[PDB]
Design a binder for this molecule. Structure first.
Ligand code: HEM
Ligand SMILES: O=N[O-]
Ligand SMILES: O=N[O-]
Ligand SMILES: O=N[O-]
Ligand SMILES: O=N[O-]
Length: 152
C-alpha cells in the first residue's frame, strides 16, 4: 500500500485537478483517445469525434471527463479503503463497457502526462511516485475484480 506521507502527496496533487476538473478530465480523455484510437471505439457517444478539434469542441466529452475524474477523486480520498467505491466501477467496465485492463493502464499513464503538461515543473519526483502508486493500487484492485469475473 501507500504510506501516510505518500497519500498526503497524492491528495495534494489532486488539489490541482480539483481546481479545473473539467479541463483536466477533457485533456485526460483527449490524450487517451489520440494516443490509443481503439479506446474511442468503446464509446458509442464519442465515435463521431473524427479529429482532435472535434474532441476539444465537444461539451459532452468535457462532461464525461468531469464524471470520470470525480469518481477517481472519491476513490483516492479513501486512501485504499475503496472496496465499495471500486466494486461497481470494476463491474460496469468489465461487464457492460467491456474495457480491457490495458485501457486502464493507458488512462493512468494519460493522467501522469496531463499533470506534467498542465503543471510543468510543479509535479515533483516525489509527487509522481506517490500518484503512480495510487493509480497502480486502483488498477490492481480493479484487476482483481476483473479476474473474479473472468474478464479479459
Ligand atoms: C480512472 C479510470 C476510470 C474511471 C474512474 C471511470 C469512470 C466512469 C464512470 C463513473 C462512468 C459512469 C458510470 C458507469 O458506467 O460505471 C463511466 C462510464 C463509462 N466508461 Fe469509464 N472510467 C475509467 C476508465 C475508462 C476507460 C479507460 C474506458 C475506455 C477506454 C472507459 C469507458 C467507459 C464507457 C464506454 C462508459 C459508458 C459511457 C456512456 O455511454 O455514457 N472508462 N466511467
Ligand atoms: O494504503 N494503501 O492501501
Ligand atoms: O508516512 N510517511 O512516510
Ligand atoms: O472515461 N472513462 O470512462
Ligand atoms: O442504459 N444503460 O446505460
Amino acid at each position: 500500500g501507500l504510506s501516510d506521507g505518500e497519500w498526503q502527496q497524492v491528495l495534494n496533487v489532486w488539489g490541482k485537478v480539483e481546481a479545473d476538473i473539467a479541463g483536466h478530465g477533457q485533456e485526460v480523455l483527449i490524450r487517451l483517445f489520440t494516443g490509443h484510437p481503439e479506446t474511442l471505439e468503446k464509446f458509442d457517444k464519442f465515435k463521431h469525434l473524427k479529429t482532435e478539434a472535434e474532441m476539444k469542441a465537444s461539451e459532452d466529452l468535457k462532461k464525461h471527463g468531469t464524471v470520470v475524474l470525480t469518481a477517481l477523486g472519491g476513490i483516492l480520498k479513501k486512501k485504499g479503503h475503496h472496496e465499495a467505491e471500486l466494486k461497481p466501477l470494476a463491474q460496469s467496465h468489465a461487464t457492460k463497457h467491456k474495457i480491457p485492463i490495458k485501457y486502464l493502464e493507458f488512462i493512468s499513464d494519460a493522467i501522469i502526462h496531463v499533470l506534467h503538461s498542465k503543471h510543468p515543473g510543479d509535479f515533483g519526483a516525489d509527487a509522481q511516485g506517490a500518484m503512480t502508486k495510487a493509480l497502480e493500487l486502483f488498477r490492481n484492485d480493479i484487476a482483481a475484480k476483473y479476474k473474479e469475473l473472468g474478464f479479459q
